[PDB]
Design a protein around this ligand. Structure first.
Ligand SMILES: Cc1cn([C@H]2C[C@H](OP(=O)(O)O)[C@@H](COP(=O)(O)O)O2)c(=O)[nH]c1=O
Ligand SMILES: [Ca+2]
Length: 129
């Protein structure tokens, strides 16, 4: 896998974001995670977390996996990096997302993320409290 450029257009919520990629606006859905919707418990904290991480980043990058790059809604499916730190992993590590939607062939970072969730669960953080 490799990282490619993008620039933030607008924060949306925990596991979605509007980015410019190859000069086109697109909504990205983060691979392998599920954040609460804004209206749910920890929804507002998830959105805050990614909003800060995304907006404060100097360099946003996207990393597609080996499988489908867009979902049925036209959302890009990627790992998103803020100044080299994966947002997807950071959310899981903080107990603000669950590992989820693990589909065969788009699951390169599964075990990295599961290791983060186990550590979040141990710390009884957020969702796991
Ligand atoms: C994360 C991800 C979600 N999806 C689809 C499955 C779910 O379908 P349904 O909309 O039919 O439930 C939906 C969940 O996204 P959200 O958690 O953003 O709602 O997005 C994919 O198809 N591939 C993926 O890698
Ligand atoms: Ca969600």
């Amino acid at each position: 896998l490799h990282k490619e450029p993008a620039t933030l257009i607008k924060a949306i919520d925990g596991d979605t974001v509007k980015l410019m990629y190859k000069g086109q606006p697109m909504t990205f859905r983060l691979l392998l995670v599920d954040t609460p919707e804004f209206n749910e418990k920890y929804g507002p904290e998830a959105s805050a977390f990614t909003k800060k991480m995304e907006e404060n980043a100097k360099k946003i990058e996207v990393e597609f996996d080996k499988g489908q790059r867009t979902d049925k809604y036209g959302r890009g499916l990627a790992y998103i990096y803020a100044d080299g730190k994966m947002v997807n992993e950071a959310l899981v590590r903080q107990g603000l997302a669950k590992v989820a939607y693990v589909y065969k062939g788009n699951n390169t970072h599964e075990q990295l993320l599961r290791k983060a969730e186990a550590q979040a669960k141990k710390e009884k953080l957020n969702i796991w409290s």
